């Protein structure tokens, strides 16, 4: 079988949809510098991880994943001591 259309596998434009702006998404950045974003339900840990070092130059201590009751996945990302996670608030907003 020959498929003529281009692949429907989900790249980051389709895995990661938007970040969060929840108070919980901001408070941990304010206190202990852990970051929150949101993505599609079919993505996996390293599919999400590919965005953070694919669109951005920020070290990933780890990516954590969660399956919400609304049908999306919530992703958490961290940094290391090399990069401060404060301007990661001013630049992004």
């Amino acid at each position: 079988i020959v498929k003529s259309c281009h692949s429907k596998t989900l790249d980051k434009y389709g895995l990661i949809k938007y970040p969060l702006t929840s108070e919980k998404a901001m408070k941990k950045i304010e206190e202990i510098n852990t970051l929150v974003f949101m993505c599609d339900k079919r993505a996996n840990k390293k599919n999400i991880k590919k965005s953070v070092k694919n669109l951005f130059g920020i070290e990933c201590d780890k990516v954590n994943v969660l399956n919400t009751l609304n049908g999306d996945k919530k992703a958490y990302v961290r940094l290391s001591g090399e990069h401060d996670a404060l301007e990661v608030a001013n630049k992004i907003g």
Binding site: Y13, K17, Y18, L20, T21, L55, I92, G93
Partner: peptide, 17 residues
């Protein structure tokens, strides 16, 4: 096409805002 979806997510930043 690749960059316009990043722009769409850039809209989404403010949308969630």
């Amino acid at each position: 096409l690749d960059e316009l979806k990043k722009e769409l997510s850039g809209l989404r930043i403010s949308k969630a805002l």
